[PDB]
Amino acid sequence: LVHVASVEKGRSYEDFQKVYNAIALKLREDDEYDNYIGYGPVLVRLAWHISGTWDKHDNTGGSYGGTYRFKKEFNDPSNAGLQNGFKFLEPIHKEFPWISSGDLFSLGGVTAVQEMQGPKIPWRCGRVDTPEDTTPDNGRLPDADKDAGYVRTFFQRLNMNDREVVALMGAHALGKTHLKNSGYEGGGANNVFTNEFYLNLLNEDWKLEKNDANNEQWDSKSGYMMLPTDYSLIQDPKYLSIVKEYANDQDKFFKDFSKAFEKLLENGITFPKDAPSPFIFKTLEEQGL
């Protein structure tokens, strides 16, 4: 099972920079969403959930096929709330119908990270929409009520190592949980990409509590929260060292996140030797827009 990247016919960097820009301008415009967080965080989560269905063993799932557009995956209980991201992207897809679904979903995540002042994420085009029967079954995305050993094992299926796992989890600086989506009660929320996930883990005074959906989560007096899988990163000694590294080196976190996130978004894709190089999109700010 091979998924070969195929450039949308006649398209080049500039074409995709126009899609980036349309996302980025809508992100700026539609600022009321989720008590003024805006859509950045949910777009990052979308890009991650369309990619995170991948299985290295048989190359099923992953971003390539754009299968989140199909009912089985759109209605996965793990994907509750991501409909908001899909709806945000709908006008963009209508404006630029030449782009594939998987390309759009993943570029939405890239755009959101960069526009939220995160690292540059190189991004490759050529994902090709696949039929409805290629949609992966529900249940391939991770549980939050688990420990470090569960997280480590789970991410082996995505070919991620300890450093890659700890780096990716830093996206949990963004946004918040919503009881109605996931059974977790959200805490202080932000829409700027920083290493604050690691700083909060190490510096806050955490208390284990049971929320109104009966689930355990870690809460701080300052109003922040951590999932049990987040907190696991300071329970396990291997994860803890990495957490400390990123809490103490913003640039290293940025560089490692960028690599991991691009890898996550490209898992399962075979890029021809003469495929275009990855694109690095300019932010609205870099363009003076």
Ligand X SMILES: NC(=O)CCn1cnc2ccccc21
Instruction: Judge whether 119 and 280 are in contact, CB under 8 Å.
Output: no
Q: Which is nearer to ligand X, 106 or 177 (CB)?
A: 177
Look at the block and give the residue holding tokens 């690599």. 259
- Under the binding rule (CB under 6 A), the answer on residue 69 touching ligand X is no
Instruction: Judge whether 230 and 151 are in contact, CB under 8 Å.
Output: no
- Under the binding rule (CB under 6 A), the answer on residue 47 touching ligand X is no
- Under the binding rule (CB under 6 A), the answer on residue 181 touching ligand HEM is yes
CA–CA separation, 63 vs 149, rounded Å?
Answer: 26
Write the CB contacts of 172 (distance below 8 Å, at least 6 apart in sequence): 197, 227, 230
Which amino acid, residue 215?
A: N
CA–CA separation, 51 vs 28, rounded Å?
Answer: 25
Residues 134-153 that bind ligand HEM (CB under 6 A): 142, 144, 151
Per-residue CA distances from 241 to 54, 122, 244, 245 (Å): 28, 27, 5, 6
- The item of ligand HEM, ligand X, none sharing an interface with residue 206, based on CB under 5 to 8 Å by kind, is none
Residues 177-216 that bind ligand X (CB under 6 A): 177, 187-188, 200
57 is in an annotated binding site: no
CA–CA separation, 206 vs 212, rounded Å?
Answer: 18
Residues 148-177 that bind ligand X (CB under 6 A): 172-173, 175-177
Which amino acid, residue 260?
A: A
Q: Which is nearer to ligand HEM, 46 or 96 (CB)?
A: 46
Cβ at position 27, least distance to ligand X in Å: 18
Look at the block and give the residue holding tokens 């091979």. 2
Cβ at position 46, least distance to ligand X in Å: 13
- Under the binding rule (CB under 6 A), the answer on residue 46 touching ligand X is no
- The item of ligand HEM, ligand X, none sharing an interface with residue 108, based on CB under 5 to 8 Å by kind, is none
CA–CA separation, 69 vs 59, rounded Å?
Answer: 19
- Under the binding rule (CB under 6 A), the answer on residue 175 touching ligand HEM is yes
CA–CA separation, 19 vs 40, rounded Å?
Answer: 15
Count the residues of the shown chain that bind ligand X, applying the rule CB under 6 A: 13
Q: Which is nearer to ligand X, 105 or 197 (CB)?
A: 197
Q: Which is nearer to ligand X, 187 or 268 (CB)?
A: 187
Chain residues in the site for ligand X (CB under 6 A): 172-173, 175-177, 187-188, 200, 224-227, 230
Annotated binding-site residues for heme b read: 45, 48, 172, 176, 178, 181-182
